[PDB]
């Protein structure tokens, strides 16, 4: 009854802007911030995480499987747990910043085609996500994708307009990467997944590279006559 | 259905223990050990990769090795739970336990220097979660420990004659040892699944080899079962 809806885009893209702007517009809505988001900083979740990501900048080829697993498993919990906890509302959306399609499908197929994980990570990355989102049947099953696009350049300049010390030195080429897998499994429509719904899975795409956050009306009004197909 | 968790050292006997307590009656399955399965599929291949990366880089495998395995015994355990559909006094025999894997082994490759704090409690993070949403009934209602010393296991490694294990050193086949004792004799050790204190346990002498004696020690375990 809670419909969910998942925001899509590459680092920096602006996700967590519209998201918090969102959530202020409507009791009714509700946000679930993405983790490694949250651990991008400066409880043993927290100490873990930063600590992972922090090893993860250092060496991605040692720490990729871990991370990824870390990252997913705690979405999944976070996921759950707002669930749980728009009991009332008569017209429940609640928002995922990123989802467990974008951890296994962009993020983790990135760094292993990017070859941080080998073939034996990446079978039981994948192995074991299957098994643990065959086991949630359609608890967290997508009502709908909005896909924040926008491009590499602009999603620089936003990380160094962000100021993240440890997010200044991902460069252009790998933020190519994420455009260019994003574009495939959202706008051009195309890449395969073992999740069946995700094609007849309906997605709203936006273009955020010019600044929003005062002039943010018409992406609103897209966001609200796409919730009401869904 | 019934769930005893048969725990011990490796070539103890809980496998040998396993393919004769099933046969003794149609009310009683078992399911073998995943990493004994990779010692073919996803799984086996996936499993038997690892496990021989562990042997080569045990410092950069452990915790994939352990979160693999956690998995594929929370899976095997579940498929089989499967088994014993028409059966009056049913009973399952875990072959080793998701404590095994956690408070033995994975706390074993953190004292050990193979796995870090982060990984470590990573894993414990992932454990206490991966349990508590897909595994709340596998748990079980008692344990059989096979115990034969660090030193009756290492000879019994060269029998199988496993090329990967005949290096295992006998320092090893040691902590692993002892740390079994501490969980379950002593009761030393402490977990974090509070019925665990409550299960109760029996414990079998296994250094007398029993392939072909093993009537007593099934008299015991009979026994066990009928005080449950
Ligand atoms: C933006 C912080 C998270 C990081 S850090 C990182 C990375 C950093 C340095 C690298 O090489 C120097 C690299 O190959 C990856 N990639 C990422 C993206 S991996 C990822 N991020 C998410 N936010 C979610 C998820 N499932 N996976
Ligand atoms: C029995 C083969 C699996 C291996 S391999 C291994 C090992 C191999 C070489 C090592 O040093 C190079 C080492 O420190 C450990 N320990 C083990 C035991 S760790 C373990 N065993 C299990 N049966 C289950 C589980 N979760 N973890
Ligand atoms: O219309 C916008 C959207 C975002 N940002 C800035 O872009 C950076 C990245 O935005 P956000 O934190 O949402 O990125 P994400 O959550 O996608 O990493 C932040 O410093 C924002 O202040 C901006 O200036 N104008
Ligand atoms: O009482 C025994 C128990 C085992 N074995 C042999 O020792 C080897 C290893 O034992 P197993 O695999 O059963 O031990 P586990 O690791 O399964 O506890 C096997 O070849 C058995 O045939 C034996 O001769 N006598």
Redesign the interface.
Known sequence: RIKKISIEGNIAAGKSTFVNILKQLSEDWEVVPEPVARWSNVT??Q??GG??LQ?MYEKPE?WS??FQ??AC?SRI?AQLASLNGLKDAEKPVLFFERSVYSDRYIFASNLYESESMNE??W??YQ??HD??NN?FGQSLELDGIIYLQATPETCLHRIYLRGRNEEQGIPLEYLEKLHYKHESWLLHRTLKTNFDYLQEVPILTLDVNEDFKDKYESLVEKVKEFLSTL
């Open positions: 043993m979740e100490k873990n600590n992972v090893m040692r499987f871990t697993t870390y498993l919990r034996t990570e079978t039981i192995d074991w098994w643990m086991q």
